[PDB]
């Protein structure tokens, strides 16, 4: 009723983006601030009502989550989906989804930190996203804040689904967030040990949001995704916006910590494995898998795995993450390790 065809289709069509609101029969409120920005407010908001930012498309070619979000919007508008939490749905960067690329000028998910950046289409976008976050979390209790940034991996992995929890002094690794991971059947969660520049990290660092960057499957065109493999996640996400089905029958996702961070020191840097190297590819102690100048790269422990490898990474930046399972527990409602 608010859309010509659907949230994702309208967003993708350049010829339609003026603000508009709408109140559903069940009391749910929908507000389209601008292209790809949809707020959903529950009929009966309370002090315990969650404020969830659900973003997708930070990278244009990662369509699966966009499709899931599109169906959730459709179900909420038809009353089929019960709405209990205040949400902000975002399809960031629709222009890149059209070019079917990761980005147009620069990786949007590296532009949220305080470093200096050159002017790019993505910079201006990131600038706008920081504003949307601010407006949505304004006058909300920190404990109610959630930010789920939905992505897709660019390479294979023994973990079809996994998530990354940002590093901040704020307690953003809660019991509810972890329960969500488990209910969603996310195979593993990587706990960052260093401040980042992602959209997820920005919410955690600046608004203490229970935030994650979630890798849902692989990249594929719209209508050509392996959607069934995301059924568990989608159901867990629907239960979250509806504040329902709070069970603990599922298994704990694997918890990883950063063994060490690899930084490119010289121009002559490379890995021995192929470019289609899978995330979480493990190594044995002392195994060489690359080299930086003269000094080779080899596993330190016996339980290390490589994550997010990138040999094109400019000099001085990180080329990879070495991770390993970690012994975890909850201390004062925060998931910590060791
Ligand atoms: Zn991504």
From Swiss-Prot:
Its EC number is 3.5.1.96. This is Succinylglutamate desuccinylase. HAMAP family: Arg_catab_AstE. The lineage of its organism: Bacteria, Pseudomonadati, Pseudomonadota, Gammaproteobacteria, Vibrionales. One of its GO terms (molecular function) is hydrolase activity, acting on ester bonds. Belongs to the AspA/AstE family. Succinylglutamate desuccinylase subfamily. InterPro entries: AspA/AstE_fam, AstE_AspA_cat, Aste_AspA_hybrid_dom, SuccinylGlu_desuccinylase. It is an enzyme of class 3 (hydrolase). It comes from Vibrio parahaemolyticus serotype O3:K6 (strain RIMD 2210633). It comes from the Bacteria.
């Amino acid at each position: 009723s608010l859309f010509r065809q659907s949230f994702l289709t309208d967003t993708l069509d350049v010829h339609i983006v003026a603000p508009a609101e709408q109140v559903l029969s069940n009391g749910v409120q929908l507000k389209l601030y601008q292209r790809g920005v949809l707020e959903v407010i529950p009929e009966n908001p309370t002090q315990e009502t969650k404020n969830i930012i659900i973003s997708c498309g930070i990278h244009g070619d990662e369509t699966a989550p966009m499709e899931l979000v599109d169906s959730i919007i459709k179900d909420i508008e038809s009353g089929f989906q019960k709405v209990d939490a205040r949400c902000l749905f975002i399809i960031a960067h629709p222009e890149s989804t059209l070019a079917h690329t990761r980005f147009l000028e620069e990786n949007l998910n590296r532009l949220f930190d305080e470093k200096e950046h050159e002017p790019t289409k993505e910079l201006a976008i990131a600038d706008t996203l920081k504003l949307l976050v601010r407006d949505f979390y304004q006058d909300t209790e920190p404990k109610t804040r959630w930010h789920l940034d939905l992505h897709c991996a660019i390479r294979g992995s023994k973990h079809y689904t996994f998530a990354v929890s940002p590093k901040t002094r704020h307690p953003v690794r809660s019991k509810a967030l972890v329960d969500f991971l488990d209910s969603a059947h996310i195979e593993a969660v990587l706990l960052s040990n260093s401040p980042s520049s992602t959209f997820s990290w920005y919410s955690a660092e600046n608004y203490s949001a229970q935030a994650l960057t979630m890798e849902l499957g692989r990249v594929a065109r719209i209508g050509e995704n392996a959607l069934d493999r995301l059924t568990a996640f989608d159901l867990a996400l629907r239960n979250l916006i509806a504040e329902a089905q709070p069970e603990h029958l599922s298994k704990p996702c694997i918890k990883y910590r950063v063994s060490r961070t690899i930084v490119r020191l010289h121009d002559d840097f490379d890995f021995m494995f192929d470019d289609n190297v899978e995330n979480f590819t493990s190594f044995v102690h002392g195994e060489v898998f690359g080299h930086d100048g003269d000094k080779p790269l080899m596993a330190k422990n016996d339980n290390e795995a490589i994550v997010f490898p990138n040999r094109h990474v400019a000099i001085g930046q990180r080329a990879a993450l070495m991770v390993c399972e970690v012994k975890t527990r909850f201390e004062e409602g925060e998931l910590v390790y060791d």
